[PDB]
Structure formats: C-alpha cells, structure tokens
Amino acid sequence: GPYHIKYAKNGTHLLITGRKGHVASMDWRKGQLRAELFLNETCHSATYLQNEQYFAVAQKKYTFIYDHEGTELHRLKQHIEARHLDFLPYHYLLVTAGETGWLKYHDVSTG
C-alpha cells in the first residue's frame, strides 16, 4: 500500500495500483482477476484505456501500456515521471502530468 483505485467508464472493472508496485485488474462483481503485476517499483497511478482490455501504469520514470492479460505492450519513453493519468474516451488521448511540469497528450490508436 497505499492503493490508488480507478474504475472503468462502465463500472464493470476495477484497477488498483499499489504504491510499492502491485497492480491488479479485475472484474470486481464476478470476482475474476484479469491481470496482476508485481512490478518491483514505485507506481503512482493507473488508468483504463478505451475499454478494460488495455490500461496504463505510471511507474518510477516511464508510463507503460499493458494488455488485458498483463503483457506489456509499450514503454512510453516520452512521458517522464508522470504522476497523474487520464484518458479522454471520445478522443482516444492519454494525458499525463508530473514533476516535469509538462502536459503531454498521446494518441493510443495511432501511438
């Protein structure tokens, strides 16, 4: 702990990211675990992308995009020390901000 929680837009899935780096994606109503990562690292926040299939995690220095099963898909080298993550659903943009004082918008569809 401590644990930062984010629900999906439709409320079906729950994403919890522990500060010491325990990240779990689950369907809380059916009690089914979609993914569980034990990244030995400092994780600040996580968010779901357009649906529960993809989620982003803001780790020590870089943001990573993960799959539904927990397989890492991308390492966002451009986003440095992001502490907040947001997703604009209708625009398909991932938004980050952190200690650098820089606001970055990233298109998940095109990358």
Partner 1 sequence: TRKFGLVKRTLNTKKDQRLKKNQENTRNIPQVSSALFFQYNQAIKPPYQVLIDTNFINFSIQKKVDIVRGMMDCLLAKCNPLITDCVMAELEKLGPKYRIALKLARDPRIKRLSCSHKGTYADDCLVHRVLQHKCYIVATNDAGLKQRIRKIPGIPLMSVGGHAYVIEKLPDV
Partner 2 sequence: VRKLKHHEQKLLKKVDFLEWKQDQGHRDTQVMRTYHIQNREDYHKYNRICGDIRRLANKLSLLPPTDPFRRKHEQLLLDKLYAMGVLTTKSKISDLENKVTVSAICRRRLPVIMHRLKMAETIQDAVKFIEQGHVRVGPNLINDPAYLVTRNMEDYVTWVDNSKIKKTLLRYRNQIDDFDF
What residues line the site for partner 1 (CB under 8 A)? 67, 70-73
| Total chain residues near partner 2 (CB under 8 A) | 12
What DSSP designation does 40 have? S
Q: Which two tokens stand for residue 33?
A: 């675990």
**DSSP 3-state assignment of 91?**
coil
Q: Which is nearer to partner 1, 32 or 71 (CB)?
A: 71
Residues whose CB is less than 8 angstroms from the CB of residue 89 and which lie 6 or more positions away in sequence, other chains included = 9, 50
Residue 48-67 contact track with partner 2, rule CB under 8 A, x = bound? ------x-------------
Q: Which of 76, 82, 85, 94 binds partner 2 (CB under 8 A)?
A: 76
